[PDB]
């Protein structure tokens, strides 16, 4: 009986050290692992016969649906095509922002004016919106 338990404990210890080099040592994007809310910093403490871990994470709520576009292509000049970086292009519902489209973070609803920092140049596609007038990131 003791031989069996010893082997299972050794394997359990291997699991813990891998979490120390993932869930504890750095932020991780793999999901599944760590707490169930993306991953942000986690901690570990000594426990009898083992280690006790705790994890912290983001728990989103009150989801709303918004209109969004796959990308924008500046239709007065079709070779200019852009798409958001780590975020989305959404129709603007904010009174502060004159821009027809707005940029948001993907973790939280928070519209912003469109600027070059939030987008990248991409190959054209037929589903990208056809903006024939004012598109600032770069304006030309």
């Amino acid at each position, epitope marked *: 009986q003791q031989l069996v338990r010893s082997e299972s404990a050794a394997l359990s210890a291997q699991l813990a050290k891998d979490k120390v080099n993932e869930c504890v040592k750095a932020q991780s994007k793999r999901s599944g692992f760590c707490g169930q809310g993306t991953h942000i910093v986690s901690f570990v403490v000594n426990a009898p016969n083992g280690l006790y871990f705790m994890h912290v994470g983001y728990y989103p709520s009150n989801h709303i649906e918004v209109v969004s576009a796959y990308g924008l292509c500046d239709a007065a000049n079709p070779t200019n095509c852009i798409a958001p970086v780590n975020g989305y292009f959404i*129709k*603007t*519902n904010n*009174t*502060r*922002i*004159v821009d027809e489209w707005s940029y948001t973070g993907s973790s939280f609803y928070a519209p912003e*004016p469109i600027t070059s920092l939030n987008t990248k140049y991409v190959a054209p596609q037929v589903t990208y919106q056809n903006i024939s*007038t*004012n598109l600032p990131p770069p304006l030309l």
Partner: antibody, heavy 119, light 111 residues
Framework: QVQLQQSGPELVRPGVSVKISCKGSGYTFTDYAIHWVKQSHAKSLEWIGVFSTYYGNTNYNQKFKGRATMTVDKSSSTAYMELARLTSEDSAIYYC???????????????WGQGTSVT | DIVLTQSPASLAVSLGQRATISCRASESVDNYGISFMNWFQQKPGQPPKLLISATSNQGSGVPARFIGSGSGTDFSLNIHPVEEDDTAMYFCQQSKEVPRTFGGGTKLEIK
């Protein structure tokens, strides 16, 4: 309690640039875009332009892109528009207005300035 | 922007009478069903006032009597209780595209 305070009317001679002001009151001024509209007759009106009060971003009616411009004094909670090169054809009743969304994704003028005019 | 037109140029009615205003558009205004149609009210000596929005026949500053209607190029306004303080010019407005133009309007009157 929202109010808009347009500057008084004037019989300005042509070729003079014309500044008009519209102070806001009773709301936080910087969170809403300002709009201007031109009325040449009670049945003939056209939009002039829009200016953000926080980011300073603007758009104009295509006919006014070489004409009127807008600026904002955020410390005074006030918005301004200045016409370039007045002509007798530009006499109008001018109205400032504030952006709103009574329906999601639908712009509406909400509160209006009392009106001012130039001739 | 899409051209808006309206008719009859003016209509006079008895007090409490139902009335309507046609407001055809040169091009459909629907974008994903958003419509972008607002109606405004104005009287001499005052600024235009918002009345309704395409999904708001109450609210947007008014009582339920102001009924906007239609889709595509077919818009209209229906007011079942027109009254003395409804004597005003009425203007369809387009929020879909810059310049954000709006119709020349029509005027209701009490006979």
């Amino acid at each position: 309690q929202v109010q808009l305070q347009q500057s008084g009317p004037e019989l300005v001679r042509p070729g003079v640039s014309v500044k008009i002001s519209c102070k806001g009151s009773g709301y936080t001024f910087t969170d809403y875009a300002i709009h201007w509209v031109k009325q040449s007759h009670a049945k003939s009106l056209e939009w002039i332009g829009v200016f953000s009060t926080y980011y300073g971003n603007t758009n104009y009616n295509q006919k006014f892109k070489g004409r009127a411009t807008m600026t904002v004094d955020k410390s005074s909670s006030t918005a301004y528009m200045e016409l370039a090169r007045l002509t007798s054809e530009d006499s109008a009743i001018y109205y400032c207005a504030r952006k709103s969304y009574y329906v999601d994704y639908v712009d509406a003028m909400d509160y209006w300035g009392q009106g001012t005019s130039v001739t | 922007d899409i051209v808006l037109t309206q008719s009859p140029a003016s209509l006079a009615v008895s007090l409490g009478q139902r009335a309507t205003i046609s407001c055809r558009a040169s091009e459909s205004v629907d974008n994903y069903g958003i419509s972008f149609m607002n109606w405004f009210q104005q009287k001499p000596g005052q600024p235009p006032k918002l009345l309704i929005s395409a999904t708001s026949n109450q609210g947007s500053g008014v009582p339920a009597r102001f009924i906007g209607s239609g889709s595509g190029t077919d818009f209209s306004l229906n007011i079942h209780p027109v009254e003395e303080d409804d004597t005003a010019m009425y203007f369809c407005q387009q929020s879909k595209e810059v310049p954000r133009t709006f119709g020349g309007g029509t005027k209701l009157e009490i006979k």
